[PDB]
Amino acid sequence: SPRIVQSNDLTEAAYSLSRDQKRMLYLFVDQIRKSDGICEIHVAKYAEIFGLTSAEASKDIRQALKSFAGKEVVFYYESFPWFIKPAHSPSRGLYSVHINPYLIPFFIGRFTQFRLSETKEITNPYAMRLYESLCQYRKPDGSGIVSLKIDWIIERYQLPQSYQRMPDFRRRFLQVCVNEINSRTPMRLSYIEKKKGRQTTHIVFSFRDI
DNA sequence: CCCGGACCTGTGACAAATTGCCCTCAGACGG
DNA sequence: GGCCGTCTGAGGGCAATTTGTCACAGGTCCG
Ligand SMILES: [Mg+2]
Fold first, then answer.
1. Same structural domain for residues A8 and A72?
2. Which of A131, A129, A136, A195 has its CA nearest to residue A159?
3. Å: A158 CA to C22 C1'
């Protein structure tokens, strides 16, 4: 299956995208990298890749695309829009998009890589952002270990504001995203909390390949 | 000693959003 | 050449689950 690669600057960038938007973004990076910023999406190709019907494919592309308007990306700082022109359909079942050409160098560079079959069953987008940022540290054999700061997790993944109360962070983000990875990817993941006084400051992740 | 306060934890409720499903019907194409 | 049967896909919806928000009980330590 397609091998996604991206500059580490994109893995650690600040942004908020849905699963459907993140799914399309993978194809943009694949399309762009296999070479002005103009990409294309076929409804029927998307459906076969992700095992959806054409109708629900159509719905996913359409709503994701109009929800891109006004979205911005921040590299740590400098902020950019993903799109500089609205999407449009020349043909039935075909969409044409204009990626901000200034993003190209950030896409292609100190890099991250994973096969598309690893993420296509993940549902929660925050969990996608976590699996991406663990791969950045993975070893050939498939293992690694990394400590991420909690304040940095929140800024980079742009978690909603009520998850700054740690028990909600635990219950609605951390446990759920570890559970999906262990149930939906080939990776086996564990963690432990680092504290300073009463505050929990970092999260320490360990992983191997099955 | 024991107090209210400033911290921390987990859970129970509800609201707002998302999931994969269903139904209709016209376009593009080929037989 | 030109009509129609079929595969697409562009729309309109649903109930069942997940995600996002906050009230309230119960732990600690300090002065
Ligand atoms: Mg969908």
1. yes
2. A129
3. 20
